[PDB]
């Protein structure tokens, strides 16, 4: 009866979110959340009371994140678009994802990803470099966290550096054990924050299952991708 109105507001909040109307979407989230609290503090049942916590805390996470980004426009950002990668979704190859935001003006790429250690992660980074050379990229700056098992990482990136150097592309790799924020930056203004980073792929089914070489057909983990501009 009263909680039914809370459903309509949150629905509009989601619509505005997808339509990239973030300032309006945020306000609707706050009202949708507030209405759920007036229901949560009213419900006596214990099973339903735990259902609302999930619903509220899920919405609250989204709302709080939007506010962070809108405050983050201090020269660093401009919440342009967010694309959700659903659990076990497809069509999210590194080419398909950065297709639009890549052009001839891009000559320098910054990447902060704390998870470029294991073998598959190295290849993920490798394919990321591959599509970055066809466009006009000169220098690539990588910042990843330090493993210690680090030989595969320290030598792996070293070989990729040498191979990129064979195409006249200079790779600069730096390590830091105290990083967490995933961040992609192009010198044209575009910036991309992926939840998992370059590791949103799950291992394939069989040795010759579809989506082993072309990651457009490869299923993905559930993650979020946020797009920004700097002008």
């Amino acid at each position: 009866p009263q909680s039914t109105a809370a459903a309509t507001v949150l629905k509009r909040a989601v619509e505005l979110d997808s339509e990239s109307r973030y300032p309006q979407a945020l306000v609707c989230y706050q009202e949708g959340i507030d209405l759920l609290l007036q229901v949560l503090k009213g419900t006596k049942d214990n099973t339903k009371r735990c259902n609302l916590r999930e619903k509220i805390s899920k919405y609250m996470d989204r709302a709080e994140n939007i506010k962070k980004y809108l405050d983050q426009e201090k020269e660093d950002g401009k919440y342009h678009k967010q694309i959700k990668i659903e659990e076990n979704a497809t069509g999210f190859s590194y080419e398909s994802l950065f297709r639009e935001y890549l052009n001839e003006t891009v000559t320098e790429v910054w990447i902060e990803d704390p998870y470029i250690r294991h073998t598959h992660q190295l290849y993920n980074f490798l394919r990321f470099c591959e599509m970055l050379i066809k466009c006009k990229v000169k220098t690539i700056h990588l910042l990843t966290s330090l493993d210690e098992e680090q030989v595969q990482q320290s030598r792996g990136l070293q070989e990729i550096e040498e191979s990129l150097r064979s195409h006249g592309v200079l790779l600069e790799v730096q390590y830091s054990s105290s990083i967490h924020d995933r961040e992609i930056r192009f010198n044209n203004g575009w910036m991309i924050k992926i939840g998992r980073g370059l590791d949103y792929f799950k291992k394939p089914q069989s040795r010759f299952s579809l989506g082993y070489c072309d990651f457009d057909l490869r299923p993905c983990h559930e993650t979020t991708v946020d797009i920004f501009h700097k002008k």
């Binding site: 989230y29 706050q30 959340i33 507030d34 949560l40 709302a63 709080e64």
Partner: peptide, 14 residues
Amino acid sequence: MEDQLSRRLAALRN
């Protein structure tokens, strides 16, 4: 729960 969530709503309208 009603104390954890209601406080987060204050951070939004802050």
